[PDB]
């Protein structure tokens, strides 16, 4: 549904810069014209009070524009009067959205004194003081909670003439506390008004003189992991792919030689096969295996299906990044078919279908006619494995061909032929084809995410949640692979596309020290060339804390180490750091859940509290929380962390 | 907003017990559904999925009627076919209600099996094994973060045959990790059933022969604090009137006198009369303060006001409740206009006007024409001081008479007659009789809430909120006492009455240390004596915890507490407690906020992290977790914690 203006901010025009909330609408019309998209409300003023069905925030008119946060808007409409107004701008790198100002908005003017005494229009309608420290930084005079911040982003960040100089975007805290904060500045929404509005990355990128990274963006099935590098090849360059999914890297080398006439080296876990061919596919993960970029290898490296956020993908692009052009590559292309801010639009060959109350087969709150997976060729995404297995038994109890596929199975359980119905996770959402009549999506995804909860430290959570549109368009593209498909679905929205939690870098750091051997130090290169590329996911810079964090983690167990990879669940290094410490101690671990098996030999012995280095999952036993390490990672916590509000 | 049925769990007839959902509707209908009271929707099922416009639980029908839990639900009406449907019953004391069962829903039958082996339903379809413990109580299989428990509050819990043994209320912790159940079994649903449908309390209850608690319920302005006590006084009995307010009390002498022909005692902390009338009013401070019942003193004690959860209110009211019948009074009325469970119904004396966007003064989010304030006399609720004062000043201003008055300014402040807009905090809430023509509120106030957050140990939380119902009336009825008056107000909605938080409890020890000279056992004993009567607001039973928490808090700095309860702040006890452990480790306080304004004198001699026993507000400086104090605080939260789900 479409972002509302529910109220707005009126500010002093003489003396002394003070403001006041004017509210507008309830929560009744907010909805119900969320919904139509059609506002009738005459709009005033420069600064907007704007809300989506589960947030509120501001917007600030500047040049004829109403600008806002992408973290907050996403590519979302306005409601308008002719209804829904798509955003004119949408520039994810600057976290910067903005639609044309409907009629009755005033537009404040661009601050051009470089004046550093600031004032911050909050959604309360305070008014308070900020240095300027730098383009896009200013200091509070007087710190704060974060969460007195919190849905103020848009709001104006004004100088003593009531001169816009940029939008609040973020606060930069000490253990939950605000002490600057980060804006966009004026300056940026300038330039983004004289930059093409449309960029069609369709076409395969030329490969230039000298190195250059590009971007390629076109539909699921359209060719780009398969034609382009066949044709780049075909040109006399030698390629490497780099794909996320071993699923689909194993499917190219089978596909390629009859698609295209050119049997490609493969490189993954299971299979490493050299034929000596142009052309190379690999995982991330494998890529990163081997240590990355080898002088004079290739002339151009693919980053594909770079929409991919998981840590393996993150490392691996940013280890592309950094070493490609010492590495003699002329061209990186990152290629993806849902790029940061992309939306999901009609798929040519999709047929998109909602599923109903109606049918023998309940999934996710409505159901599945039986006669919609009788024969043929299926995939249904499902948000965990036990829903998986489930599911996979359901349908085989009902004479149903069905399969379950996800993380450490194998490939090869997945009939390439004959009817069959397959039920996965992620696994199987980017680069496979599998010939699919139809997939149906349960539009539901886990993701983790930090809280710093001072408890004593961080705590790593997963939760289930609504898909993005990264999600929605890549599990929809599985189908409709060079021939007609259909797509069925629970719920019909998406969360906005191109953004990643700080858990990830954490993840990244972990798979640095536990896989890779990279000092924190070495992952964090790899990371800052990925932060400092644009056009790519965007994540909040906490690169100089978790690498903090991890550096301090030393002389970790071996043994407990080996295990926790060989297990292959989450933050091997976290897990058995934290195991590291419990088993010096002889204390147990903060639960006996089966994360914390490596250490279940011990346990006869292991008495007392835990001595907690932070919060991985439940924690049953007891906890001591001054342990040196516990004391050095709450050190790590006091440097700067921006966080959004 | 009604409560909506938004889905259905549907149950198996037969074998094992399985569940899964089905799902009706979005915030499509929801939070539309919920603001408009109107669903055709055809009900099914025998577990309902339902929700307001903020949350989501569950409902179960049994012998014909939809239960669920007042926490959740509160006093709302279930959106239905013809509109909003009333609820039926409404137990606060039990945390249940329910509306007759839509048509379309089918009961679950109350089980007798006297099976101690129960299934709980959650409200994602999960079915777990819980051992039954007590009539209302039982265990878990396998311990849970309670997040997972969330949501799920109206849920069944079933016996191996698939019969109702109860509904889920609310989980049993031990740091955050639910380890049991709590639940409202069917033999509460029956007594609840049977039980009167309206008990009318309008009249002064008769003065028994042996000690009796007694129920007054009637509209603001009827007569309860004057009339009924002097009604009582004429009959030859000795009252004493314990009232919240301050203004009300110092207020009724003069009145009394010449509406009722009583010079009566007054007991205020800023003020005492003694004239040895057969009638006192007392605010619940000055009594408590007094040492609390005085043998063979009075007959009939009423505490006033009784839907006051103040701290004060709460320990004063508990105190009566345990010493009375050993004083030898022989009648204790608990007296309000508005008890636990009531929504604002229209008054005969009050005309509501919504406030528009229209007029000269911008008031939260609204606006006030000057002509409806200039003149007569009117009274204006803010949320806080800050506010008040501000609005005072605008007001003088546009050349009104306006005062702000709230707590630390004095009575007289107020002028008793002749034009004024007096702007006021709840200190004029409850009680008061000012003359006002109107009054205009501005729907929200200022709550305190413990999160047991575990950093290292709880927090308290003061937070803006919406006005519940008893807010509201109680403002609302400021005005319309004996003529008629105008109510002017910013937003329609109200919050459920009748409830409050377990941080109240919190101060009520607090406040037992630091001015009353009460142990906290002391302390105990009244608050269990007010938790064990039926008919007052309700609170989470956390009596032992926070005993136990403030047993431990020895040897506070005498000259920090007495600077503390000199200052007026929040909770002086603690603060200065924790103000002693950080002069006595040479350590700074959390901060420099005025809070801690205590320990400025010895600033210059405090250096290093702040030894932290909880938290009160936001903590700037670095902290240490290591202080035996902090210890013996987190091993008073490894307690059993009941919250609600
Ligand atoms: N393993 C495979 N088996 C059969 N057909 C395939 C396979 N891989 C690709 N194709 C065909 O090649 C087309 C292009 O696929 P691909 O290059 O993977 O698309 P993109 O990367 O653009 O999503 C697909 O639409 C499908 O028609
Ligand atoms: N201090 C006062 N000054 C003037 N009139 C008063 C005062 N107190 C009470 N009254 C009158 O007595 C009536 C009953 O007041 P009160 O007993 O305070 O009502 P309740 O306690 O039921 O709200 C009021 O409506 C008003 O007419
Ligand atoms: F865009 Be394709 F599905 F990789
Ligand atoms: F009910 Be009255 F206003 F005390
Ligand atoms: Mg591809
Ligand atoms: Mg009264």
Redesign the interface.
């Known amino acids: 549904g479409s972002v509302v203006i529910v ?1 707005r901010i ?1 500010l002093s025009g003489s003396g002394s810069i003070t403001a ?5 609408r ?3 019309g907010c ?2 014209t969320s ?1 139509t998209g059609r506002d009738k409300n005459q709009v005033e003023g420069e600064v907007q009070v704007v809300s989506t ?1 589960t947030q509120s925030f501001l917007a600030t008119c500047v040049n004829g524009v109403c600008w806002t946060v992408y973290h907050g808007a996403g590519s979302k409409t306005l409601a308008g009067p002719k209804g829904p107004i798509t955003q004119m701008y949408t520039n994810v790198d600057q976290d910067l959205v903005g639609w044309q100002a409907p009629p009755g908005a005033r537009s404040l003017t661009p601050c051009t004194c470089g004046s550093s005494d600031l004032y911050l229009v909050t959604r309360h309608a305070d008014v308070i003081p900020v240095r300027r420290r730098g383009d896009s930084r200013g200091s509070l005079l007087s ?3 974060v969460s007195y911040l919190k849905g103020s982003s848009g709001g104006p960040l004004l100088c003593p003439s009531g001169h816009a100089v940029g939008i609040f975007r973020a606060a930069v805290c ?4 605000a002490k600057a904060v980060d804006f966009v500045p004026v300056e940026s929404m300038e330039t983004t008004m004289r930059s093409p509005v449309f960029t069609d990355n369709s076409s395969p990128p030329a490969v230039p003189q000298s190195f250059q990274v590009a971007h390629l963006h076109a539909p699921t099935g359209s060719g780009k992991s398969t034609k382009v590098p066949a044709a780049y090849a075909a040109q006399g360059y030698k390629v490497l792919v780099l794909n996320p999914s071993v699923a689909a890297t194993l499917g190219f080398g089978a596909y390629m030689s009859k698609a295209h006439g050119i049997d490609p080296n493969i490189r993954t876990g299971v299979r490493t096969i050299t034929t000596g061919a142009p052309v190379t596919y690999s995982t991330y993960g494998k890529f990163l295996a081997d240590g990355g970029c080898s002088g004079g290898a290739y002339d151009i490296i693919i980053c594909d299906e770079c929409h991919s956020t998981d840590s393996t993908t993150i490392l691996g692009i940013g280890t592309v990044l950094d070493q490609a052009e010492t590495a003699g590559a002329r061209l990186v292309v990152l290629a993806t078919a849902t790029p940061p801010g992309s939306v999901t639009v009609p798929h040519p060959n999709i047929e998109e279908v909602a599923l109903s ?1 109606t049918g023998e087969i ?1 999934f ?4 599945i006619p039986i006669e919609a997976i009788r024969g043929g060729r299926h995939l249904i995404f499902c948000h965990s494995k036990k829903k998986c297995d489930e599911l996979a038994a359901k349908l085989s109890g009902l004479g149903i061909n069905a399969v379950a596929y996800y993380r450490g199975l194998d490939v090869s359980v997945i009939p390439t032929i004959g009817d069959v119905v397959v039920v996965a996770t992620d696994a199987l959402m980017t680069g496979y084809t599998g010939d699919f009549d139809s997939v149906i999506d349960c539009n539901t995804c886990v993701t983790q995410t930090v809280d710093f ?4 430290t961080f705590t790593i959570e997963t939760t289930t949640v609504p898909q993005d549109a990264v999600s929605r368009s890549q599990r929809r593209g599985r189908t409709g692979r060079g021939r007609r498909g259909i797509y069925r679905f629970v ?1 019909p929205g998406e969360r906005p596309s191109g953004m990643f939690d700080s858990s990830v870098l954490c993840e990244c750091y972990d798979a640095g020290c536990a896989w890779y051997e990279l000092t924190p130090a070495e992952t964090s290169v790899r990371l800052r060339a990925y932060l400092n590329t644009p056009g790519l996911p965007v994540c909040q810079d906490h690169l100089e804390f978790w690498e903090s964090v991890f550096t301090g983690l030393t002389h970790i167990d071996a043994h407990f180490l080996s295990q926790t990879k060989q297990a292959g669940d989450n933050f091997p290094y976290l897990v058995a750091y934290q195991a590291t410490v419990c088993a010096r101690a002889q204390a147990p671990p903060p639960s006996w859940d089966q994360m914390w098996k490596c250490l279940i030999r011990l346990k006869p012995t292991l008495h007392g509290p835990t001595p907690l280095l932070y919060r991985l999952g ?3 036993n ?1 906890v001591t ?2 342990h040196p390490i516990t004391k050095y990672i ?1 050190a790590c916590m ?1 440097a700067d962390l921006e966080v959004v509000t």
């Open positions: 109220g009126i006041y909330s004017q509210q507008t309830g929560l009744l909805i119900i919904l069905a710190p704060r909670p000490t253990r939950g506390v109350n309940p996710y709150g409505k159901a909860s001072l408890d004593p719920t439940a924690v049953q007891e929380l001054t709450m006091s």
